[PDB]
C-alpha cells in the first residue's frame, strides 16, 4: 500500500569534553538503510540494507558530504540557540530533525514532512501544506523569519514532491524482494495463574514485518480494549518485530476469551484461544 | 537520497 522514507538527525552538545555528537539514520518504512555517526573511526554515510549497496561511489560520497554539512549546521545552530534562549555555554543541549515523504500505492506523494525540536520540544515545523511554517515560541520565530526570507519552503517542497518521491520509488523497486514482502506474526497464547481466582492470558505476535499490527482480546465476541495491556512493539534485532497483549481473567473463564491478530502478512485475520 | 541547500542556519 503506502510507503515512507524518513531521515532522522540528532546533535548533542558536550561542554568541556569536545564538540557535539551527531547521529543520523535513514529509513524506508521500518527498514534502516543508511547511517552516519560523527564518532565513527573515519565518518562516512554507511549502508545498512542490501538493496542500497548497489548505489555507486558518487552516491556514497554525496550522502557523506550532506551528513557532514548537517552536523556542522547543527554545531552552529546549537550556539545560536544558546543566544536565543539566554542559556549558558556550560549545559548540554539537543537539536533533532526529521524529514521525509509518504507515497500512495501508485507511487504518488501523499504527505511531506520537515520538523525540528530543541531539548525534546517542538521548535519549528513545515506545515502539512509544505508552504508555510509553524514556530513553537519567540526564538523559533527568529528562525521562521530567516527561512521565509531565503524561500526555504519552496525548495524543500520541491525536494519532497520530487527527489524524495522518486528515490523512495527506486528504493522500493530495488528492495521489493524484502521491502514489499510482509512477514506474518508467529502467534501463541500463554496462561499465567496469579491466584486460584485469576490468571493472565497473554497473546504473542513474533517475527513480523512491517511493525504495524493490531492485537485485541475479546470476551464472548465483545471488545476488551479498555481492559487490555498492550506492550510497546519492540525490535527482535533481525529487522522483524515482537508484541503482546494481555488480559486478567477469572480462573475457569479462560474459554470465553479470544485473541485477534491483524497484520499485512496475514491474508485473513487470526482468532486464537489458550490451549484448550 | 538526502536533501541539502545552503543558508539553512537557525
Amino acid at each position: 500500500g503506502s510507503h515512507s522514507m524518513r531521515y532522522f538527525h540528532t546533535s548533542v552538545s558536550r561542554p568541556g569534553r569536545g564538540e557535539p555528537r551527531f547521529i543520523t539514520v535513514g529509513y524506508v518504512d521500518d527498514t534502516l538503510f543508511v547511517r552516519f555517526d560523527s564518532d565513527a573511526a573515519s565518518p562516512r554515510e554507511e549502508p545498512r540494507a542490501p538493496w542500497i549497496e548497489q548505489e555507486g561511489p558518487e552516491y556514497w560520497d554525496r550522502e557523506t558530504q550532506i551528513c557532514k554539512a548537517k552536523a556542522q549546521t547543527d554545531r552552529e545552530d546549537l550556539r545560536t540557540l544558546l543566544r536565543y534562549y539566554n542559556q549558558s555555554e556550560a549545559g548540554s543541549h539537543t537539536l533533532q530533525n526529521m524529514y521525509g515523504c509518504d507515497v500512495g500505492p501508485d507511487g504518488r506523494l501523499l504527505r511531506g514532512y520537515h520538523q525540528d525540536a530543541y531539548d525534546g520540544k517542538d521548535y519549528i515545523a513545515l506545515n502539512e501544506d509544505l508552504s508555510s511554517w509553524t514556530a513553537a515560541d519567540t526564538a523559533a520565530q527568529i528562525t521562521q523569519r530567516k527561512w521565509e526570507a531565503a524561500r526555504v519552503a519552496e525548495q524543500l517542497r520541491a525536494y519532497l514532491e520530487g527527489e524524495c518521491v522518486e528515490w523512495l520509488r527506486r528504493y522500493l523497486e530495488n528492495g521489493k524482494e524484502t521491502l514489499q514482502r510482509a512477514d506474518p506474526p508467529k502467534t501463541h497464547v500463554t496462561h499465567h495463574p496469579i491466584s486460584d481466582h485469576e490468571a493472565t492470558l497473554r497473546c504473542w505476535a513474533l517475527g513480523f514485518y512491517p511493525a504495524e499490527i493490531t492485537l485485541t482480546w475479546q470476551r464472548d465476541g465483545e471488545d476488551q480494549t479498555q481492559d487490555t495491556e498492550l506492550v510497546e512493539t519492540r525490535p527482535a534485532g533481525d529487522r522483524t518485530f515482537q508484541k503482546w497483549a494481555a488480559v486478567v481473567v477469572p480462573s475457569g473463564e479462560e474459554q470465553r476469551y479470544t485473541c485477534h491478530v491483524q497484520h499485512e502478512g496475514l491474508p485473513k485475520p487470526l482468532t486464537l484461544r489458550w490451549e484448550p | 537520497k538526502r536533501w541539502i541547500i545552503m543558508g539553512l542556519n537557525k
Partner: T-cell receptor, first 114, second 114 residues
C-alpha cells in the same frame, strides 16, 4: 573554477549590460555569487543564486541569468549608471569542501561611458 | 548593523616587523575568514574559523596566525613582515560554514618595505 572571459566591458550610460560567467563543478549542490569592487578597493556583495532555486535571483538593478544546463551565471545590470564603473567578480562555493572556500573569477572591468 | 569592520584600511610595514589586522562583526556570525587578493593569484584563503575557539588553515596559511577568542573578533597576526606579504587583505564573515550572507570587510592595503 570560474571563467569570466571578459577582462573588460563597456556600456553607454542608461543601457543594460551583461557580464559573462561560466562555472565548473561536478557537485549537484552549489551557490553562485557576484561582488562589485569599486576603485576604493572594497568588496561589495551584490547577489546570490542557489543551485536548487528555480527562480532567477534579482536584487534591485542586478539580475543573475542562471542557466544550469549551460553552466552559466551571467550578471545583468539594468539602467547602467556612472557609479557602476568597477571590477565585477563571479564566485562560487560547492559541496566538495562543505562550501568552505570561495572560488573567484579573474573579474571584469566595467566602463560605463557617458 | 555596520556588518564587518576591518582595520586598518591602509598599512605600510618595515620587513621583519609585526602587525595585527583587526576584524569585528556585529551580526552574530559563526563563520569568519581571511583572504588575500593578488594579481593572477585571485582571492586565496589564509585561515578560517567555524566558531569560538576553532581555527583552521586555508590555502596560504604560512607566515600568518589567527585566534578566535570570541564570536565577534577574528584578528590576523603577521609575526614577521616579508615583502611577499604586500597584498590587499579581506576579512569575510557569514552565518555558518554553508551560509549565504557572504559579506566582506573594507580591505587592508598592505605595503611591506625593506
Amino acid at each position: 573554477k570560474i571563467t569570466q572571459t571578459q577582462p573588460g566591458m563597456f556600456v553607454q550610460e542608461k543601457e543594460a549590460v551583461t557580464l559573462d560567467c561560466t562555472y565548473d563543478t561536478s557537485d549537484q549542490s552549489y551557490g553562485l555569487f557576484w561582488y562589485k569592487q569599486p576603485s576604493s578597493g572594497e568588496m561589495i556583495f551584490l547577489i546570490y543564486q542557489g543551485s536548487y532555486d528555480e527562480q532567477n535571483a534579482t536584487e534591485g538593478r542586478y539580475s543573475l541569468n542562471f542557466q544550469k544546463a549551460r553552466k552559466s551565471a551571467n550578471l545583468v545590470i539594468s539602467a547602467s549608471q556612472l557609479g557602476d564603473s568597477a571590477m565585477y567578480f563571479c564566485a562560487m562555493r560547492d559541496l566538495r569542501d562543505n562550501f568552505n572556500k570561495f572560488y573567484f573569477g579573474s573579474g571584469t572591468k566595467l566602463n560605463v561611458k557617458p | 548593523n555596520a556588518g564587518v569592520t576591518q582595520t586598518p584600511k591602509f598599512q605600510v610595514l618595515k620587513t621583519g616587523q609585526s602587525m595585527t589586522l583587526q576584524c569585528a562583526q556585529d551580526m552574530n556570525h559563526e563563520y569568519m575568514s581571511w583572504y588575500r587578493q593578488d594579481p593572477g593569484m585571485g582571492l586565496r584563503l589564509i585561515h578560517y574559523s567555524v566558531g569560538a575557539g576553532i581555527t583552521d588553515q586555508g590555502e596560504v596559511p604560512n607566515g600568518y596566525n589567527v585566534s578566535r577568542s570570541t564570536t565577534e573578533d577574528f584578528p590576523l597576526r603577521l609575526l614577521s613582515a616579508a615583502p611577499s606579504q604586500t597584498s590587499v587583505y579581506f576579512c569575510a564573515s557569514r552565518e555558518g560554514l554553508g551560509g549565504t550572507e557572504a559579506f566582506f570587510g573594507q580591505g587592508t592595503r598592505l605595503t611591506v618595505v625593506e
